[PDB]
Amino acid sequence: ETVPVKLKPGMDGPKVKQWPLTEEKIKALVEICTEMEKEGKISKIGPENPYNTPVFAIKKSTKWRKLVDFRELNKRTQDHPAGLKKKKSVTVLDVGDAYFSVPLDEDFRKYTAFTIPSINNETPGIRYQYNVLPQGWKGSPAIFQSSMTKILEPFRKQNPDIVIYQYMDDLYVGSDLEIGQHRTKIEELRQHLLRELHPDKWTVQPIVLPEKDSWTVNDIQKLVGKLNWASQIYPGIKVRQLSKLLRGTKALTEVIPLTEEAELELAENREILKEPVHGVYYDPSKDLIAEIQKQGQGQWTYQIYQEPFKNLKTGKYARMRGAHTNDVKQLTEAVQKITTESIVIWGKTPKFKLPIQKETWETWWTEYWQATWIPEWEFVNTPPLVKLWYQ
Amino acid sequence: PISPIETVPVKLKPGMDGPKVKQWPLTEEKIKALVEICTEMEKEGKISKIGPENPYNTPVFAIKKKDSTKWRKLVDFRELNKRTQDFWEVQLGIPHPAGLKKKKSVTVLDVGDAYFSVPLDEDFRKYTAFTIPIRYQYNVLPQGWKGSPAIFQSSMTKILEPFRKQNPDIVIYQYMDDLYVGSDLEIGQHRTKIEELRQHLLRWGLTTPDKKHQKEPPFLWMGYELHPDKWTVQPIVLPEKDSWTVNDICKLVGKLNWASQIYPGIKVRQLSKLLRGTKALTEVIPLTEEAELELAENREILKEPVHGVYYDPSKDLIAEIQKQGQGQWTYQIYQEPFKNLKTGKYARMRGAHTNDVKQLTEAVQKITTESIVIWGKTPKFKLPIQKETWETWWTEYWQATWIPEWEFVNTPPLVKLWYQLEKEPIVGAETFYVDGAANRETKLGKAGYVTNRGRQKVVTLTDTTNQKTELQAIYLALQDSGLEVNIVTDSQYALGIIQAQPDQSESELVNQIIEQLIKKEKVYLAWVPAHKGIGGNEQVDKLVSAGI
DNA sequence: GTCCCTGTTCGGGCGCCG
DNA sequence: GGGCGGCGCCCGAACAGGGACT
Ligand SMILES: *P(=O)(O)OC[C@@H]1O[C@H](n2cc(F)c(N)nc2=O)CS1
Ligand SMILES: [Mg+2]
Ligand SMILES: [Mg+2]
């Protein structure tokens, strides 16, 4: 028995062209789709359905998992434990398979259309639509919510300390237990469901000022610029005295000794950079912006904010590697880590401002995706100034 | 006959009606061809005579085909097309012969009168009405209706599905109604399977006329001649005109881009630049010297004989890239060293300012996705860029960039960064504090500098902008400094441009700047916030502000 | 806000296939 | 002569976004 769903008023369904898949992905998709259609989960369709949503596959194991980029459909589809961010360990189970049991509103099926492509365009694309709740669709956890609650009732009663949160395809299970009997409890929950993260170790990456025993006109000029920008975030920051050292037209390399006033100003600003940002409240009605900066040498900084300079969180991803490093792979790993953190903290995924060319990103990011969700993103060709401020 | 495939339901767009357009006059030859076609189609039930019960009508004509006496019957369904619902096109791309694997036995077939063998949704037939100077309606797919390509391609896929499921190891390239059929069978068993396929297709209402049943090589297919172990493109004929119009140039460049898929070294930058800000196709553009030279070189290239090979999946895919000038690149994709699978050109200009490493990166990207389409895998690269060049660039560039498995190749022009900003300021070198200001109302500006050695200069400018004046200040410092110089700007605009290390700009001023930067031994560019009283910057700001 | 500049999309023309 | 769909290419005309200015 199905549940009717509409789109948002004034909106049509997704019309997103499929991107080129590799042979291994098309093969995995064809085999998976054959099985899915044998089981009545999907049906073949043709050109008279005007909608489309790209599909691909990820190898998490020698089994592939189909992944549908429902970002658009999700935007267009009709419309949280604050203690989960504190569990000693949190495990992430894929429970999307559940959704293949609930039927899908017939009038809605046309919006879940997708196309399997062909190597070298041997054939036209071969199109399908869904007859059950699709994985990767906002509506699937929503409609399955009641059955999920009934399924998880006795496990939560028998484990009142454990926090079980759901985000779209995944169960985030959080405990303060030692990671060994924790794994025991997770296998209890997986056996029960026939019917590894550590948020207490996440930390803020603060702004840091250079420690020097000799300062040049260049050093002080760079400091004043950094502090000027930082003051937009910490209004307590003061530059008047350091800037006073710069009067005149001096050679960049000239050594300038700090006065007493400027040394105290720098110590005060040093302390002010430790205090937490004042006046930053999470707005559920707004998106989460996540900016990433590539700092070089496998170092990445990021900020999660909703209004400019109101950072909900700042952090870094530091995969220390030089010999053979893949900026794109690292960047998609960073994106997945940041998204995981945001899902855990706020239950939303961020919109990413990615420091990459759109084409490079779109060429390679599917080679490294490992998550069942996909965040919004845009591509910035953004400046080296903010890059310098977060290093 | 008519295919017993179930029809595909098609609606008009929300709240619309069928076409009500009056016919136009037709020639005697066109009317005779139309009437012969129409009585023959009426016998077969592909068109049904209609009377007063049909309000709608839309125009009809015919054109000569590539076969001699056969006329193609066409309808101007532009109005119906407007009113007809949207489809998802299922033809995602064009098959390419470099993507074919060697087969023991090959056949090429065409389906005759293909659209006219697939039934049209009964409800929709009435909107397809037309007269002949006799009133008919379409019972099959018409030519010129926007739904016909996709409906036919999908219906053909459905029609072939049982033969493909029964013969998974026979490869059938299915472009619209054209089939290429490859098998690892000895020629006799293959021919039997082909008779099986033709009987299968005919069972589904598709006839394969023997006149278009190619049994021996070479096969004519998709613009190519397929030989047993090599393929070629059917000949290309560039016009040999003297007065070139925008249409003439569009044709020339389209044929050249088509040729570039197997002819190495094709360049169309100069012929393409020749089209900027055009009025109409009929305008006569005069060939600039550089376009004349480039067209000559292209002609020479095309005089050579060339071929591609077929894909061997048990080997590596290799792509080698060479740089030509002006942001142009060609590439050869091969598996064995002198046997190109195919070739190509990348020449797209991304960005006001760029350099050869960015351009190379985006050529690598374009080639990578093109390879994923044709062969389903990424190729291994051979690039004229030293691993150290790349390492430097990836180190110091603020954006995530990456090139897949590659190997340096020593064929010039090697790709290099043409200058290198200092990471630290230069001791002893003169320090220029630069600024510009522009008056938004008058568009007068000043650019200039002070220096720690006491020099100061202001250049006035007319018809300028703030960004232009910031650049002119940097350019003025480069002009008046020596081989080593520190420069302090308050302009993150100019800083971002110059840190990016461009070797080419569409801005003449940025190019002059670039030339200066290439001439210098050491250059350090530093940034400071404007209007905060910072020492050197304050005096320049006071100098260039005087006019504003 | 406005002006300037930069990047992206999308629709026009041609080529090629059918 | 002209109708259609696909893909390629290039260009210009809309936008969007961000920095600088009054
Ligand atoms: P195919 O049917 O094998 O014909 C060869 C080329 O096709 C061109 N053609 C085909 C077609 F289906 C439509 N609608 N237009 C068109 O020009 C003519 S020669
Ligand atoms: Mg203060
Ligand atoms: Mg300025």
Numbering used by the authors:
A (entry chain B): 6 to 65, 68 to 86, 96 to 211, 233 to 428
B (entry chain A): 1 to 133, 142 to 556
Give the authors' words.
Two of the six classes of the United States Food and Drug Administration (FDA) approved drugs for HIV-1 treatment target the reverse transcriptase (RT) protein, an enzyme critical for the replication cycle of HIV-1. While NNRTIs are allosteric inhibitors that alter the chemical catalysis rate limiting step through conformational changes, NRTIs mimic nucleotides that bind to the active site of RT. Since NRTIs lack the 3′-hydroxyl group necessary for chain elongation, their incorporation results in termination of the viral DNA transcription. In this study, we describe the crystal structures of RT in post-catalytic complexes with double stranded DNA (dsDNA) and two NRTIs —the triphosphate form of cytidine analogue (-)FTC (2′,3′-dideoxy-5-fluoro-3′-thiacytidine) and the triphosphate form of the thymidine analogue d4T (2′,3′-didehydro-2′,3′-dideoxythymidine).
The post-catalytic complex of (-)FTC monophosphate ((-)FTC-MP) incorporated into DNA primer of a dsDNA bound to RT, extends our earlier structural findings with the pre-catalytic complex. The overall structure of the post-catalytic complex of RT together with (-)FTC incorporated in the DNA primer does not highlight any significant changes compared to other structures of RT in complex with dsDNA and NRTIs. The α-phosphate groups of both copies are in hydrogen bond distance only with the side chain of residue D185. The copy A of (-)FTC-MP establishes further interactions, its primary amino group is in a long distance hydrogen bond (3.4 Å) with a water molecule, and its oxygen of the oxathiolane ring is interacting with the side chain of residue R72 (3.4 Å). No electron density of any Mg+2 ion is observed. The RT post-catalytic complex with (-)FTC-MP evidenced that the 3′-OH of the preceding nucleotide is attacking the α-phosphate, validating our hypothesis that (-)FTC needs to undergo conformational changes in order to get successfully incorporated by RT.
